[PDB]
Amino acid sequence: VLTQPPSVSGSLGQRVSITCSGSSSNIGRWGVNWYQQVPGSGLRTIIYYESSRPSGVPDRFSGSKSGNTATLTISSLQAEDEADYFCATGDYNIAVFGSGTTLIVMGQPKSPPSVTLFPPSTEELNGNKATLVCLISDFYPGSVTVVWKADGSTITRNVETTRASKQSNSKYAASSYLSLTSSDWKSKGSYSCEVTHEGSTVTKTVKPSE
Amino acid sequence: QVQLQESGPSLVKPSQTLSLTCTVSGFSLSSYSVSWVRQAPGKTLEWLGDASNGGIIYYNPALKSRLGITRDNSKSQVSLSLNTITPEDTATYYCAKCSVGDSGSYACTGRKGEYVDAWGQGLLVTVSSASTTAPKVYPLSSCCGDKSLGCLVSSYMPEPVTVHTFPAVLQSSGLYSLSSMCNVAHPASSTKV
């Protein structure tokens, strides 16, 4: 396996580069290719051999090789470059890949988390089960913490929360669920989804009266 | 244009055989090599094997005892079978079109002009004993008084599902659930809503 830095950071417009370290039997012997992978999507080849660009790949992307290390450079970082990057070549009898680098775009301003907390439905309670859905949208950075309350008391019973995601606006999103029974939702008077974000709580609450 | 489509069961039980087919179009397998690679969740890429335009099959020696790859130019298909699977074989499986009939190295690398010029979309195959479950979907509204819609595709298996949609969560029930900011589509369950 070729070694790549786990992450590289830069702000918009900066020059950033990503290295790929191997040996004389791979990077030292063969050309080196690079693949771009946007989170959730597939793969795209952006550089091959030395610094060749497939059609459609802008000239901001370039590559070079020095000894047993290959370097992928973005001369001016843009927002659509936030993705993972993998180097690729061959060894004696196998294909080898780099361990991958997440390219992080830093220097962004903060945004408040939009929380539309929803109660379950009449079909769910007729099948005696309650699914509280706490959706969180548009915040930077992505390190929010959600604490559920039942009339003002901590809850860790049946709490699953997707970690910080990334849609398409250079921000982060997350969803949290409360998979409790029918009586458990009808018992208490009010449940709340308390979301923390850099020292800011945006609590929402619907009570079973409606 | 050029297109590569991965097909096969996306949920296989451990110890069974995982089989996939890549059907290609827009180009002839007599002209270009085709590679299979996979990416386990949150991990890097792993090479499975290559199938050159001359019928030569190159394997990852770490997987050769379980791996078989076949190439049918007449049907424009390159297939893979992987037996004796375990959850370590859960991955997104990609086929890929090489720019040449046979590259100097493996997985379409090596010499000048040799690169993957078209990637498949990938097919996530989950290795698990769970049963294929079509999701129970409901609407999500907040009609409880305010001074001011989402979907509830819950309890399905396996991933993925297609619909601001959120990534799914793995509840303790062993099933997946997600929501969106309604048309949901679970290809493994064959159901549409």
Author numbering:
A (entry chain L): 3 to 212
B (entry chain H): 1 to 148, 154 to 168, 180 to 197, 212 to 223
What do the study's own words say?
The H3s of B4 and B13 are of different lengths, comprising 21 and 25 residues respectively. Viewed from the top, the antigen binding regions of the two Fabs show differences in both shape and electrostatic potential. Both Fabs have a negatively charged cavity surrounded by positively charged areas, but the B13 cavity is much bigger and the negatively charged area is broader, consistent with the fact that the two Fabs bind to different epitopes of the bRSV F protein. For B4 a large portion of the CH1 domain of the heavy chain was disordered, including residues 149–153, 169–179, 198–215 and 222−233. This analysis shows that amino acids 100E to 100 L of the HC in the B4* structure have very little involvement in the interface except for Gly100 G, which is completely buried. In the B4 Fab structure, all of these amino acids are involved in the interface with ≥20% of the amino acid buried. This string of amino acids at the interface in the B4 structure contributes four hydrogen bonds, involving Cys100E, Thr100 F, Gly100 G and Glu100 L, which are not present at the B4* interface.
We have investigated the role of the LC in the structure and activity of two neutralizing cattle antibodies (B4 and B13) that bind the F protein of bovine respiratory syncytial virus (bRSV). B4 recognises antigenic site II (residues 255–275), whereas B13 binds to an epitope contained within antigenic site IV, V, VI (residues 417–438).
